Enzyme design. Structure first.
Site, PDB file in Angstrom:
ATOM      1  CD  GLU A  44      22.566  24.102  -6.556  1.00 28.80           C
ATOM      2  OE1 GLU A  44      21.805  23.462  -7.290  1.00 28.80           O
ATOM      3  OE2 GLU A  44      23.592  24.805  -6.999  1.00 28.80           O
ATOM      4  CG  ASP A  73      24.514  21.879  -9.095  1.00 26.08           C
ATOM      5  OD1 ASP A  73      23.903  22.861  -9.689  1.00 26.08           O
ATOM      6  OD2 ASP A  73      24.091  20.732  -9.021  1.00 26.08           O
ATOM      7  CG  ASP A  89      26.371  18.078 -10.674  1.00 26.92           C
ATOM      8  OD1 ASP A  89      26.042  19.250 -10.798  1.00 26.92           O
ATOM      9  OD2 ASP A  89      25.934  17.098 -11.450  1.00 26.92           O
ATOM     10  CE  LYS A  91      23.076  15.304  -9.841  1.00 26.68           C
ATOM     11  NZ  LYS A  91      22.815  15.125 -11.277  1.00 26.68           N
TER      12      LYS A  91
END
Lengths: 240, 240
Positions: A44, A73, A89, A91
């Site tokens: 991230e 996120d 988001d 992953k």
DNA sequence: GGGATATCCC
DNA sequence: GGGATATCCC
């Protein structure tokens, strides 16, 4: 396009994956391991610089969640049109040996999907888009940590827990499947496919409604899931 | 012995237990946030060299899981007595007002606790002692991560995710409770007291036996346990 | 107390 | 697939 621009900057524009370890106020360095729970964050952190970038040259605001258990996120958007909220988001997922099929967990199936407000930075409706940023790495393991403390000089020595990362962007519904990704944690699962199938979005649901419906009524117990449905074929036939 | 030795080391032999951020090999640092899944692991990294140094100086061999989802984190053993295995698990929790009561989550009540080998590194029967090294901390209320990338020189301008860390060494059965830690994940609940009680090793269970029978019996949910037992004071009579 | 964040093992 | 690590949030 926020998207095109995004996708563009994700594939090495000058970006290099080089996170070696953790650092304490004492100045001494502790290497990483295959803990997924930490690797996630590291993944991230690689994106957070690039999203914000584009987001800038596009005029949208970005809003990370204040609390620890809320999705997603990132939350891009423009005040004027504060209903055109996009949602990104991150992953991650790992491979052992080259060209294997992968799968990710796409999130909760009994939360804001069905509740709209439960666990989401913003009421499910303000979002027009939901993107997924998927990463694949070759985990370097056979593990048992790296039993040692380093210093600001041996940085180059420090072995990483990953190799040959692979990124791609895509709408969630495009790469969602018909099987739970996690059981007890009620997660959704991704398509079992070749990385490239993801890029291309060679999915299984024909559109975003087909994807919401299916998941909206995916009973949680196998007992109840029998007399209703377990998969796409099962569900489709359930349309009559 | 092995035990009090560990404690000294873990009780200000100089150590501070502070973290700064993540650190790449080009030397660019990234700060952290109060995210638990992360902090719980960093606290881990801190503990491994401390453990190793003591065991090793008493002739013990050490064991770490390969699977990220097996207990315990650490596994110290003497080959001259292989059936004398000891467990060590790092457990963290936070508080705001530097004083309020506390709660931990120590493992699942439906695995090695009832079948000898589910999600365990060696068999339950091969362990003599099970230890909990607990860390508590004050976390910067709310949460502000920010996205600045310092460096070694600016090591001081970097915001820390927590402050005022605390640690304790104690046995698993002495710090356990009669309520769940979590639900969907089925975890044992630590006692709900004050730091010290923990240091005191001032629990509730009578024996390492009572706690066993106790959690060995915990029904998975309200329905079942509401007409059986929902607490020790309830466990008791039920025992007749 | 029940379910929520992430992704994994057998 | 069901249950497992990490612990929390509401």
């Amino acid at each position: 396009s926020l998207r095109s621009d995004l996708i563009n900057a994700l594939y090495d524009e000058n970006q290099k994956y080089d996170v070696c370890g953790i650092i304490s106020a004492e100045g001494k360095i502790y290497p990483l391991g295959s803990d997924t729970k930490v690797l996630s964050t590291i993944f991230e952190l690689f994106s957070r610089p690039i999203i914000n970038k584009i987001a800038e040259k596009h005029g949208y605001i970005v809003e990370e969640p204040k609390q620890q258990n809320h999705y997603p996120d990132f939350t891009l958007y423009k005040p004027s049109e504060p209903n055109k909220k996009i949602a990104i988001d991150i992953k991650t997922t790992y491979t052992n040996k080259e060209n294997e099929k992968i799968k990710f967990t796409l999130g909760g199936y009994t939360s804001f999907i069905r509740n709209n407000t439960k666990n989401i930075v913003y009421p499910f409706d303000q979002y027009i888009a939901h993107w997924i940023i998927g990463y694949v790495y070759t985990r370097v393991a056979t593990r048992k940590s790296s039993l040692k403390t380093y210093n600001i000089n041996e940085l180059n020595e420090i072995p990483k827990p990953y190799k040959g990362v692979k990124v791609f962007l895509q709408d969630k519904w495009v790469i969602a499947g018909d099987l739970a990704g996690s059981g007890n944690t009620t997660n959704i699962g991704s398509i079992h496919a070749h990385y490239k199938d993801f890029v291309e979005g060679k999915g299984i649901f024909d559109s975003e409604d087909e994807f919401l419906d299916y998941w909206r009524n995916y009973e949680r117990t196998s007992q109840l899931r029998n007399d209703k449905y377990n998969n796409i074929s099962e569900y489709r036939n359930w349309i009559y």
